[model samples]
Target: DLQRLKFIRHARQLGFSLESIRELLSIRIDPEHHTCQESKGIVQERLQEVEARIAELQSMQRSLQRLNDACCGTAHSSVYCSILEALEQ
Candidate 1:
């Protein structure tokens, strides 16, 4: 159905992977065959995965910020560059 294509596009836009969308479509195929709680759990799991990636990115953000700070206005050679020192460690 055209609706399935639209639904797949929407799910992809929402950051769901293809396998996850397939699982969701199965739930839709026989609505009564699946429980709302099970679907909710699956969605919650996806949310957790997104949250973990966000947390990881945040950690990288902090590390980059510190490196930027270390490299800012140092007026020194590479011998004493803190950023280089950080990389070496």
Candidate 2:
């Protein structure tokens, strides 16, 4: 139905994974059999996943920043590129 499609679109916009959206939809379509606790569990699981992903990205950013800081820019050639040297290791 159009309403379900709209729900899916909104969920996607909020960054819910497809699998999580499907699970949530199943619960939504059968609210009589599902409790709020189940929905909270799904949300909590997704929150942890997002938090972990953010931590990973932050770590990558730190590593990239270090590489960027190590570089002397145009003053040095690729022959002595610190970024490339770090990557090689």
Candidate 3:
């Protein structure tokens, strides 16, 4: 039980979903019926998800950076703020 808890905790730290962890735990508890390739496939799926999220965040960062650069901090009023203008459109 302690070993299973340890595995679950470690998997969670590595960002594995609870459902994925459950599948992994079952395979771990009964390795005779599971192959390493099956575990690798699960990890591969997760890696793709993380990569896609990273790409989305990068796109957001680029957009935010462009908006930030468009604004001049010296402006005394927001009435002419390029960031706000862009958002309005």
Candidate 4:
């Protein structure tokens, strides 16, 4: 009962998704006997997932900055909307 309560608390505090909390709780069931390989493998997988998301966000940021720079031309009108024109192409 106490372990289940703590598990709920941890899950709530971290705001983790269902599967994420489930996976973590699986690891939690036997922290003492958890193998080095199991820990390392899970962490490596999470790291790669995080890195891929970061790269995609960076690419999105670059595209937004390019659009802003391209629209830097004077006068604000449909005729001067280069970003819109480029996007429409």
Q: Is 2 or 3 the stronger prediction by TM-score? A: 2
Estimate, for each residue in 1-89, the C-alpha lDDT of model 3 and write its tens digit: 89888989999988999889999988998999999999998899889989999999999999999998878888459988988888889
TM-score sort, best first:
2, 3, 1, 4
Better of 1 and 4 by TM-score: 1
Candidate ordering by lDDT (highest first)? 2, 3, 1, 4
lDDT tens per residue, model 1, 10-64? 8888788778889999998889889989778778888998999999999999998
Which of candidates 2 and 4 is the stronger one according to TM-score? 2
Instruction: Looking at model 2, report the run of 10 residues with the lowest lDDT sum.
Output: 68-77
lDDT score for candidate 3 against the true structure: 0.91
Looking at model 4, which ten-residue stretch has the lowest summed lDDT?
A: 11-20
lDDT per prediction? 0.85, 0.93, 0.91, 0.75
Better of 1 and 2 by TM-score: 2
Question: What lDDT would candidate 4 get against the real structure?
Answer: 0.75
Indicate which candidate wins on TM-score. 2
lDDT, residue 38, candidate 3: 91
The alpha-carbon RMSD values of the candidates against the true structure, listed in the order shown, are 2.1, 1.5, 1.6, 3.6
Model 2 alpha-carbon miss at residue 66, Å = 1.3
